[PDB]
Scaffold this active site. Sequence first.
Site, short mmCIF file in Angstrom:
data_model
loop_
_atom_site.label_atom_id
_atom_site.label_comp_id
_atom_site.label_asym_id
_atom_site.label_seq_id
_atom_site.Cartn_x
_atom_site.Cartn_y
_atom_site.Cartn_z
N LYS A 1 -3.77 8.39 2.59
CA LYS A 1 -5.01 8.06 3.28
C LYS A 1 -4.97 8.56 4.72
O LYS A 1 -6.00 8.84 5.31
CB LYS A 1 -5.28 6.55 3.27
CG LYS A 1 -5.71 6.01 1.92
CD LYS A 1 -7.01 6.63 1.44
CE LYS A 1 -7.53 5.94 0.20
NZ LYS A 1 -8.58 6.74 -0.50
N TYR B 1 0.84 -1.19 0.00
CA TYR B 1 0.00 0.00 0.00
C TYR B 1 0.88 1.25 0.00
O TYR B 1 0.56 2.24 -0.66
CB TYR B 1 -0.96 0.01 1.19
CG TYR B 1 -2.21 0.81 0.91
CD1 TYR B 1 -3.04 0.47 -0.15
CD2 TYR B 1 -2.55 1.91 1.68
CE1 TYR B 1 -4.18 1.19 -0.43
CE2 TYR B 1 -3.69 2.64 1.41
CZ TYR B 1 -4.50 2.28 0.35
OH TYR B 1 -5.64 3.00 0.07
N1 NAD Z 1 -11.42 -1.25 -3.49
C1 NAD Z 1 -11.05 -1.38 -2.22
O1 NAD Z 1 -10.76 -2.48 -1.72
C2 NAD Z 1 -10.97 -0.13 -1.38
C3 NAD Z 1 -10.78 -0.25 -0.01
C4 NAD Z 1 -10.71 0.88 0.79
C5 NAD Z 1 -10.85 2.12 0.22
N2 NAD Z 1 -11.04 2.25 -1.10
C6 NAD Z 1 -11.21 3.68 -1.64
O2 NAD Z 1 -12.39 3.72 -2.31
C7 NAD Z 1 -12.38 4.72 -3.35
C8 NAD Z 1 -12.95 4.13 -4.62
O3 NAD Z 1 -12.16 2.98 -4.98
P1 NAD Z 1 -12.85 1.68 -5.59
O4 NAD Z 1 -12.10 0.50 -5.10
O5 NAD Z 1 -14.32 1.73 -5.39
O6 NAD Z 1 -12.56 1.87 -7.14
P2 NAD Z 1 -12.73 2.33 -8.60
O7 NAD Z 1 -11.31 2.17 -9.13
O8 NAD Z 1 -13.77 1.72 -9.45
O9 NAD Z 1 -12.88 3.91 -8.43
C9 NAD Z 1 -11.79 4.84 -8.28
C10 NAD Z 1 -12.29 6.13 -8.87
O10 NAD Z 1 -11.27 7.14 -8.83
C11 NAD Z 1 -11.67 8.10 -9.78
N3 NAD Z 1 -10.58 9.04 -10.02
C12 NAD Z 1 -9.24 8.79 -10.07
N4 NAD Z 1 -8.51 9.85 -10.34
C13 NAD Z 1 -9.45 10.86 -10.48
C14 NAD Z 1 -9.33 12.23 -10.78
N5 NAD Z 1 -8.16 12.84 -11.02
N6 NAD Z 1 -10.46 12.96 -10.85
C15 NAD Z 1 -11.63 12.36 -10.61
N7 NAD Z 1 -11.87 11.08 -10.32
C16 NAD Z 1 -10.73 10.38 -10.27
C17 NAD Z 1 -12.09 7.28 -10.99
O11 NAD Z 1 -13.06 7.98 -11.77
C18 NAD Z 1 -12.71 6.03 -10.34
O12 NAD Z 1 -14.13 6.05 -10.44
C19 NAD Z 1 -10.93 5.19 -3.45
O13 NAD Z 1 -10.74 6.46 -2.85
C20 NAD Z 1 -10.17 4.11 -2.68
O14 NAD Z 1 -9.13 4.72 -1.92
C21 NAD Z 1 -11.10 1.13 -1.92
C1 68O Z 2 -6.23 -2.78 -0.50
C2 68O Z 2 -7.59 -2.09 -0.47
C3 68O Z 2 -7.66 -1.06 -1.40
C4 68O Z 2 -7.55 0.26 -0.97
C5 68O Z 2 -7.64 1.28 -1.90
O1 68O Z 2 -7.53 2.58 -1.49
C6 68O Z 2 -7.84 1.00 -3.25
O2 68O Z 2 -7.91 2.02 -4.15
C7 68O Z 2 -6.71 2.46 -4.61
C8 68O Z 2 -5.49 1.82 -4.38
C9 68O Z 2 -4.33 2.38 -4.90
C10 68O Z 2 -4.38 3.56 -5.63
C11 68O Z 2 -5.60 4.19 -5.85
C12 68O Z 2 -6.76 3.64 -5.34
F1 68O Z 2 -7.90 4.23 -5.54
C13 68O Z 2 -7.95 -0.32 -3.67
C14 68O Z 2 -7.86 -1.34 -2.75
F2 68O Z 2 -7.97 -2.60 -3.16
#
Ligand code: NAD
Ligand code: 68O
Lengths: 257, 257, 257, 257
Positions: D162, D155
Amino acid sequence: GFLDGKRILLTGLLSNRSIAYGIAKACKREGAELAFTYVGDRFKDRITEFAAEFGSELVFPCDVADDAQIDALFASLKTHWDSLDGLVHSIGFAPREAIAGDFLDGLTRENFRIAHDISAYSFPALAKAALPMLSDDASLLTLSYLGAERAIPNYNTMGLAKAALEASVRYLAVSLGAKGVRVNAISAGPIKTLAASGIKSFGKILDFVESNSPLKRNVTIEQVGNAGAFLLSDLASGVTAEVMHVDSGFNAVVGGM
Amino acid sequence: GFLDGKRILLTGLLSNRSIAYGIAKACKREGAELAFTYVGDRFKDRITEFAAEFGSELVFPCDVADDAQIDALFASLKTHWDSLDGLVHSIGFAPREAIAGDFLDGLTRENFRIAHDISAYSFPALAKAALPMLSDDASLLTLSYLGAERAIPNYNTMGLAKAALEASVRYLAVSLGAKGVRVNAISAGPIKTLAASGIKSFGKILDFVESNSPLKRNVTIEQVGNAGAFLLSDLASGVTAEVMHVDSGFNAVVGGM
Amino acid sequence: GFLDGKRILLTGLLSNRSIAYGIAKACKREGAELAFTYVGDRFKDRITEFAAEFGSELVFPCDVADDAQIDALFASLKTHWDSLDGLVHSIGFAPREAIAGDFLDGLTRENFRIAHDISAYSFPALAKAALPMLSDDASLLTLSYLGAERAIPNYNTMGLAKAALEASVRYLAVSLGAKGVRVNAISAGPIKTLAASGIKSFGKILDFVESNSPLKRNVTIEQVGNAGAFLLSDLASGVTAEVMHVDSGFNAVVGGM
Amino acid sequence: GFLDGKRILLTGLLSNRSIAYGIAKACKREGAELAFTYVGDRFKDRITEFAAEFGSELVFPCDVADDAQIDALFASLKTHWDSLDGLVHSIGFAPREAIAGDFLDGLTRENFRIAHDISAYSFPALAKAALPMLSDDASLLTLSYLGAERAIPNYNTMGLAKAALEASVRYLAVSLGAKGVRVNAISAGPIKTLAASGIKSFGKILDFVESNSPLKRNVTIEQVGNAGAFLLSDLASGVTAEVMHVDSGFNAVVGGM
Ligand SMILES: NC(=O)c1ccc[n+]([C@@H]2O[C@H](COP(=O)([O-])OP(=O)(O)OC[C@H]3O[C@@H](n4cnc5c(N)ncnc54)[C@H](O)[C@@H]3O)[C@@H](O)[C@H]2O)c1
Ligand SMILES: CCc1cc(O)c(Oc2ccccc2F)cc1F
Ligand SMILES: NC(=O)c1ccc[n+]([C@@H]2O[C@H](COP(=O)([O-])OP(=O)(O)OC[C@H]3O[C@@H](n4cnc5c(N)ncnc54)[C@H](O)[C@@H]3O)[C@@H](O)[C@H]2O)c1
Ligand SMILES: NC(=O)c1ccc[n+]([C@@H]2O[C@H](COP(=O)([O-])OP(=O)(O)OC[C@H]3O[C@@H](n4cnc5c(N)ncnc54)[C@H](O)[C@@H]3O)[C@@H](O)[C@H]2O)c1
Ligand SMILES: NC(=O)c1ccc[n+]([C@@H]2O[C@H](COP(=O)([O-])OP(=O)(O)OC[C@H]3O[C@@H](n4cnc5c(N)ncnc54)[C@H](O)[C@@H]3O)[C@@H](O)[C@H]2O)c1
Ligand SMILES: CCc1cc(O)c(Oc2ccccc2F)cc1F
Ligand SMILES: CCc1cc(O)c(Oc2ccccc2F)cc1F
Ligand SMILES: CCc1cc(O)c(Oc2ccccc2F)cc1F
């Protein structure tokens, strides 16, 4: 509502000011069936009327100091409910000298024992006694205070117990978690209740939180109630072992300066 | 050394593997005068051998379960010492079933009472009984484990008690801080000690910490001892109400992945 | 002393009130060899005078905004020192508007960027740049503030950076840990320094901490210095990834009530 | 539902796996009106298809890297909606090298800048640009990960960002709180999403959480969605400045043993 068909047992309802009353009010609104506990006899009448307000005839005695009354609580409950979907542990006690003035002045082995016996141990104890009839996706909820995380004036011995309580949340969640059961706590901000009157400078705490909390306001039993109903519901099926602050954001700041 | 002329009372020295022994070695090395406690009678001889090993004749019985032995500890010590500059609380106990297997399996009201009585209450109890002879810049030190902060397998009831202990650190700090006294804890990593043999599968925690901790190594009583000496000394005069992790950094990661 | 033969590079020494000055003095006292950095030319004479006070001629320019000076810093140091035993990151900066009044009023993409560039990135940046000449059990040290953990008035954008900084401690510790290197932070209490004048109503915070902290007193750079020297030394070899509060215990209470 | 008549603007909806989709999915169910953002032109068609799925024609471009598009976002929205009841910040980005392998290997001043610019700064930035049209009891929501609290493999630089983000939550809550606006974050467990593919060994994390989390199961976008809907509603009017863990309780254990 989002608690339709869920059967929830509430402890600690003592007055219409009680936190357990606020949670009860919300659980009913969201479709729950409620059962209540009381301690002492004279309170049988008042709690039966509280139960009646929430469309329930299910009221049971339970002094968590007695192993016998705890086991008996759920033997009686099993005859009405085949299963239990929710349990709310809203119980707290300390000898008043142990929650007034200096921490050491009111510290005695006996005051320590009681505060922890009643305010902390009783939660996993009730959890253990209910386990045979808990539903697979049941939800247990207890109430804590910021005083477990940081030293707050007058809270004293009670802060030690709540730290033990918040720890039991984590250990209960692991133990009951494989079965699909969730265990959480709400760290509520200061509310004027019967128990609150045992805290020497409670009024000073209220004004300070109202002044320094991000939202510039104290919380209500309605707000704590909605948060509790949420955690008790499947809306929060992804949430366990959590201590959630419902205190208008006060825990996250350094106020007064 | 940096503890010259400081008089420190040490509890919990049982073998040359005990954490209290490591602290003792470091305190003596840095010029402190030491006094020790023991529990039971039969142990009166062995602690004297350990006490002499550190150039001391001062040994006193103290089973922290008995109010009487606690008061007598510091009355007896007072006949030798004009004041007390440091106190080390290296005490822990729980019925082994309460630190074995599932959390609820070993949960009984009596197991809860004892673990918290001995492992948590005993710290501020010793603080209160010592208060009359504590110096302006005296320093109290206790030992905790990450199991208070997060659920660790098998630690169970002891995790609840350790959470109360870490809370007592903060309330003690507020109470005694005005007089100038500091109160801290070390959250130590796993060390194979006599007490360690009571936690089933202690060996897996050691292997896991050695593999996943940032420093890729377990800690020693030499390291915890040095850490203790720091906290007991005027070097840490700006540090109170602290829980210090001495666990090769393990608390700060999510290892295993 | 407990830093005999250790070679330590200290940044952020700007005046005799600087936290880095307190650390230097404790490090020198305990037998370390010191090297210092400065930013800008005008400050070259000032630091050279400070370096002489600690028996050192080793002074090097390093504005952490410039990648070139960072790499050049450790190229120059390498010609004098075969290895480096300790590195202290006592650097922080943000445009004053971003640390005054409301959080959003002073929020701009550029203010955010700079605050994080100087106050956060520069620590692991210097760590990466130093790694080629770091000893097997070297120790890196940075300075943080409680404003990372909780919202403090006027600290604003700097609180965000400090959270990133404290996070960098943890990720650095894992990265550098296998080699045997330790990485820690001191969360210092309010100290009247040059940087302090950038915090509007710094004085209000000082009064509040003196009034509400457990030890009822603010800390000094001598106290933070001794604490820093400890963490930089092999006395703290079991300690890494730690954010240690040296603030008279202020972090552990809710004051004002 | 419990979001009747609330108008919510959702960012970060990219696919039917996106966390933002789960939240959108829950908000519509609870009676909300939705508007969405997208970044880049090529995605304009796709998001409109999604917005239509939720009965909305309101779609706006917004690359949060450009100050201009942010301001323009809420200028365009103002023409359709006089007020905004909810804002969801579900945005994250970092160069793939900065979230792969060792923390220092992928560390550059520039990778750091981008990760913090997009994943952290963009949140309070959007809050500020929205402030003129936020309702008195509006609710802002962001997504974080446990990697802010503890060092998680791979990470890396993203954990720092974060951490700054979770701090911005607290400072925002204070800044917007007097007006009655709440600001929270959900620290979500691992969800296999498009963004997830940037983290090496995502699967290794999934296997570990399912095995060691108390509920012995990973979380879903439905579960995070319901939790999000709650915080956005007046049910959580007592909740602000909170980081709520929706990760099956994983954050609260030490797994692997
Ligand atoms: N997926 C996970 O396991 C996980 C876990 C914890 C937190 N998160 C957080 O959740 C949020 C969404 O991630 P997700 O996993 O749902 O994924 P996802 O990849 O489908 O969404 C990420 C989003 O970031 C947006 N984005 C990136 N750069 C951008 C910019 N410059 N301007 C506008 N939009 C921009 C994209 O449009 C996209 O929709 C993120 O902030 C990530 O940190 C994800
Ligand atoms: C490990 C859990 C986790 C956290 C994220 O913030 C996540 O979303 C990102 C991770 C790295 C870079 C940008 C992201 F939005 C995806 C994800 F799987
Ligand atoms: N009100 C606040 O400001 C506040 C803030 C944070 C946390 N809390 C917690 O909320 C919980 C409920 O307190 P409240 O303020 O709603 O007040 P309340 O005083 O009306 O309720 C406390 C309850 O404890 C019960 N109780 C005490 N000893 C008992 C025993 N031996 N056996 C069974 N029940 C016993 C009483 O019957 C009573 O209903 C407590 O755990 C308290 O720590 C309250
Ligand atoms: N060993 C570890 O890995 C580890 C890690 C973290 C914390 N700790 C803590 O360190 C402390 C010392 O444990 P150790 O590992 O050095 O072990 P140890 O077993 O050698 O010492 C434990 C001590 O507790 C004392 N004790 C037990 N019951 C008592 C009672 N009723 N009255 C008085 N004294 C009593 C014993 O006399 C003994 O000296 C304990 O508080 C333990 O919780 C140990
Ligand atoms: N003084 C306090 O109350 C307090 C409290 C907590 C943490 N801190 C931390 O202490 C450190 C500074 O100590 P202080 O506050 O006593 O102050 P100080 O003002 O004497 O030092 C700040 C230092 O930052 C350096 N610096 C600024 N921009 C720089 C750049 N671009 N490149 C290189 N160096 C740069 C300056 O040269 C100066 O030496 C900072 O990291 C600050 O966050 C201070
Ligand atoms: C300071 C806010 C607060 C916290 C409580 O736990 C509380 O409940 C108790 C306090 C002391 C002893 C028993 C309680 F239930 C009341 C109260 F007002
Ligand atoms: C990290 C593992 C561990 C933790 C302890 O607190 C510990 O000390 C005790 C644990 C249970 C009961 C009494 C103890 F002293 C021993 C031990 F091996
Ligand atoms: C409020 C206590 C405190 C904390 C700091 O991090 C601090 O250091 C800085 C604050 C703002 C800008 C640059 C700093 F180094 C100064 C200070 F007085």
